[PDB]
Each structure stands twice: as structure tokens, then as C-alpha cells.
Amino acid sequence: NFPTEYFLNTTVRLLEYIRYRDSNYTREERIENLHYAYNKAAHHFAQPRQQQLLKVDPKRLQASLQTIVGMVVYSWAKVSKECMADLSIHYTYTLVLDDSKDDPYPTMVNYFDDLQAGREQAHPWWALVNEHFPNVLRHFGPFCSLNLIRSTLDFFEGCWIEQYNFGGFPGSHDYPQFLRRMNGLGHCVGASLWPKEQFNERSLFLEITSAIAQMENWMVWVNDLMSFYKEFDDERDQISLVKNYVVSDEISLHEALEKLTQDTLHSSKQMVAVFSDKDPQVMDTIECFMHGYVTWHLCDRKYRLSEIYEKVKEEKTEDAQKFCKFYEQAANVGAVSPSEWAYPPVAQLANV
């Protein structure tokens, strides 16, 4: 059975820590951004070239794009529409790669020589992604760009490793987090929060570098925690961070979850303690990211958190009540019908 009360406490603690609260980011603006980002992305993935090299089921691509646009628009609240759009395309490419089963070995034998010679990469995903990267990179300085480039390369290796469905050898304590950082896009996310149009990479080098180091772990551990419910009974999902802790550290799922919450909460506290008294705009970007990111998890049907809300909807517990109130806040500004922005479907644009 699912740890409903323990889960509730940790989630409410998490939201109190980050100061989860209302923003000046309206529903009308949200919808403007969502539609803008979706429209440009939809037209991108509907081009014949992208349609033929990116082997993905149409319905899944449609669902992945909607999940990603939502994540971007809701978390990168301070960037321009163009920026949210271009990042939506990139993060949609990354999410889509988890659909491939194909062994990367054959397509990576000449990776370096082709890269050094400027020849198109054999692996189709790299062909599309590297060709489109400039559209994402033009929004950033060299330092941030380098971070985006590295994290995406790491991500490619992460997916490669996951094709093995390996949680690590019992006793291999360093494996779980090593893998989570590989597939996390922590430095991609962290650095993409600072467009050169709103921030000076050099004047803020220290705080930006610090945001990356701290945000990397906050972002992945929070996703792990929020995803813990939808993955609890999913016999298909076999190698999550928590599940790998169980196998690699030889501990109970309960202890693995304890470890996760401890790290998540501590990360939340230090996040605040370090950026409260720092450049205002920076703390603002970080603050809105954390809140949007959480909102997105509570509102996206993928994580099915509404099932938890609908279960403890009438309990008199302080936690359950604190949670429902938070959830209602989220739903208040986040719950948006896909028909208000995500249209027409990519497939239709593809036929045209």
C-alpha cells in the first residue's frame, strides 16, 4: 500500500520550505505563453524532415510536447516567448529519446570523427538536435551555452545506459545518483534559466554557477518525489532513483524514500538560505522556477496527483488539509484545458 500520510507530510513540508505561494503570473498570460510555445514547436515537429528522422508514435509525441510546453511555460516564467518556445523544442527532443530502444553503439562508432569533421551525425536524434541547437543557444552566453551542450550529451549517455534496465550492482552505492545526474539535464535546466537578454553571465557568474550546482539536485529530487506516486505500482518503470537505491544500497523501499525526502527537504532549505539575500532578479527566477515546477507537477495528469487530492479531500488532518489547500492553489492558476492552447495537433500540421 502507498504511504499516503508520509507522502503528504513531505510534500507540505516541501511547499512550506520553498514558500509555495501565489504569483503575479495570470491564467491569461499562461495561456498566451502556452499557445505561443506550442504553436512554434508544433510547426517545427510537423516539418517533413523532423517527421521522417524522429521515429516516434504520433500520439505519444503529441502528449510529450504538451507535457513539456507546460513545464517550460510554467517554470521559466521570466524568459521571453521565443525562449520558452525554443526550450520547449529541445526538452521535447530529450523526452522523446526515452522512446527509442535502438542500441546507440552502431551510430556512435564514428561520433567524434564526424563531429570534428563537421559531417552530419549517423544517429538521427543527434542530427535533428544539433541542427536545432543554435535556436536554443542564441538566447545564452558562452558559459551557459557550454552547460546546455554538456548536460544534453550526458543525457544521451544516460538513455544509452538505461536501455540495459540496470539498477546497479548490490553494494554499488555510487551508482544511483551517478545515473540520476546522467539523465537529469540538471545543468541544462539550471543554465537555461539565465538568458543573456535578462542577465549578464559575467557579472553574475558566481550566482549562476551556484544556481546550477544547487538547482541540479533540487530539480531532479523533486521530480523523483512527485513522480513517486505514479511509479509506485508501475511494474514497467523498474529503474528509478528510489528503486535503484533499494537495489544498490540494499535497503527497504521505505528507507530509500526516506533518503529521498531528506535530500529533497535539505536541498529546499539551502536553496532559500543561499538566494534570499542575493540579487533580486536572480532570486526571482529561482523562486518562480521552484513554484512553477511544483505547480506543473500538481496540474499535469501524468503524475496523477489529483488522485491523492480526491482521496484526502475530506480528512481533518493538518497535513491533508494543508495539502488540499496547496493543490487548490495550483489548480487555481495551473489547471488549464488543453483545448485552450494545444491546437491543432502536430499530426494535422504534418499532413498539410
From Swiss-Prot:
Q: Which Pfam families match?
A: TRI5 (PF06330)
This protein's pathway reads: Sesquiterpene biosynthesis; trichothecene biosynthesis
Its needed co-factors are:
Mg(2+); Mn(2+)
The record's EC number reads: 4.2.3.6
What controls its activity?
A: Benzyl triethylammonium cation (BTAC) acts as a competitive inhibitor of trichodiene synthase reaction in the presence of pyrophosphate (PPi).
Presence of keyword Magnesium: yes
Q: How does activity depend on pH?
A: Optimum pH is 6.75-7.75.
How is the cofactor bound, as the UniProt entry phrases it?
A: Some of the cofactor binding sites show unusual localization within the protein.
Relate the outcome reported for changing S227T. Increases the KM for farnesyl diphosphate by about 77-fold and reduces the kcat by about 9-fold. Leads to complete loss of activity
- So what family is this one in? Belongs to the trichodiene synthase family.
The identity of this protein, by name, is: Trichodiene synthase
Instruction: Give the originating organism.
Output: Fusarium sporotrichioides
Q: Which gene encodes it?
A: TRI5
